[PDB]
C-alpha cells in the first residue's frame, strides 16, 4: 500500500525521482519550459548533471515527506502552503501539479511493481484541493 510505496520510493530516491520527473516531462513537453537548465538535453545528459540529480532528489524527498505526514492520503494543510508559497513555484497553478500526478500514476501502473497507484491518485487529488485552499490559482 501507500506507506510501503513511500518506503520503496525513498529506498531508491534519486532513480525514482529522475524516472518520474522524466515521465512527467515526456508526457507534457511544454512543462519543460519551467526548467531552462534542462532544455535540449537528453536523458543521459540530464542524469550526468549533478544539478538535475540534486533538484529531482530534493523535490521528490519533500514529496515523500508530505506523503509520510498525510493521514489516509490526506496531506497537511501546512505542507500544501509550503508548496504554494515557495518562490520557485511563483506563477504555477494547480494544473501543473495535476499533470505531475497524472504522469506519476501512469508511471506506477506501467512499472510492473506493486505500487498502490489508486492511493497515489487520491493523494494527488487531495493535495491539489489543499493547494487551491492554500491560495494556488
Ligand atoms: C508535490 C509536488 C512538488 C514538490 C514536493 C516540489 C518541491 C520542490 C522543491 C523542494 C524545490 C527546490 C528544489 C531545488 O533545490 O531545486 C522545487 C523547485 C522547483 N519546482 Fe517544485 N515541487 C513540486 C511540484 C512542482 C511542479 C508540478 C512544478 C512545475 C511543473 C514545479 C516546478 C519547480 C521549479 C521550476 C523549481 C525551481 C527549479 C530550480 O530552481 O532549479 N514543482 N520544487
Ligand atoms: O521538478 C521536479 C523534479 C522531480 C519530480 Br518527481 C517532479 C518535479 Br515537477
From TrEMBL:
Heme b 4 binds at residues 36, 55, 89. Pfam families: Globin. Gene3D superfamilies: Globins. Heme b 7 binds at residues 55, 58, 88-89. Keywords: Heme, Iron, Metal-binding, Oxidoreductase, Oxygen transport, Peroxidase, Transport. It comes from the Eukaryota. Heme b 10 binds at residues 58, 89. Heme b 6 binds at residues 51, 55, 89. Heme b 1 binds at residues 55, 89. Heme b 3 binds at residues 55, 89. InterPro entries: Globin (IPR000971), Globin-like_sf (IPR009050), Globin/Proto (IPR012292), Mb-like_M (IPR044399). Heme b 2 binds at residue 89. GO terms for molecular function: heme binding; metal ion binding; oxygen binding; oxygen carrier activity; peroxidase activity. SUPFAM superfamilies: Globin-like (SSF46458). Residues 1-136 form the Globin domain. Heme b 11 binds at residues 88-89, 97. Heme b 12 binds at residue 89. Heme b 9 binds at residues 55, 89. Heme b 5 binds at residues 37, 89. Heme b 8 binds at residues 55, 89. The keyword ATP-binding does not apply. Belongs to the globin family. This is Dehaloperoxidase B. It comes from Amphitrite ornata.
Amino acid at each position: 500500500g501507500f506507506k510501503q510505496d513511500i518506503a520503496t520510493l525513498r529506498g531508491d530516491l534519486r532513480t525514482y525521482a529522475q524516472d518520474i520527473f522524466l515521465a512527467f516531462l515526456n508526457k507534457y513537453p511544454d512543462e519543460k519550459r519551467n526548467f531552462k537548465n534542462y532544455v535540449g538535453k537528453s536523458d543521459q545528459e540530464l542524469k550526468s548533471m549533478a544539478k538535475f540529480g540534486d533538484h529531482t532528489e530534493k523535490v521528490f524527498n519533500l514529496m515523500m515527506e508530505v506523503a509520510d505526514r498525510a493521514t489516509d492520503c490526506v496531506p497537511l494543510a501546512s505542507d500544501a502552503s509550503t508548496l504554494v508559497q515557495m518562490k520557485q513555484h511563483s506563477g504555477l497553478t494547480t494544473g501543473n501539479f495535476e499533470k505531475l500526478f497524472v504522469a506519476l500514476v501512469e508511471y506506477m501502473r506501467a512499472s510492473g511493481q506493486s505500487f498502490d497507484s489508486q492511493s497515489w491518485d487520491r493523494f494527488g487529488k487531495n493535495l491539489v484541493s489543499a493547494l487551491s485552499s492554500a491560495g494556488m490559482k
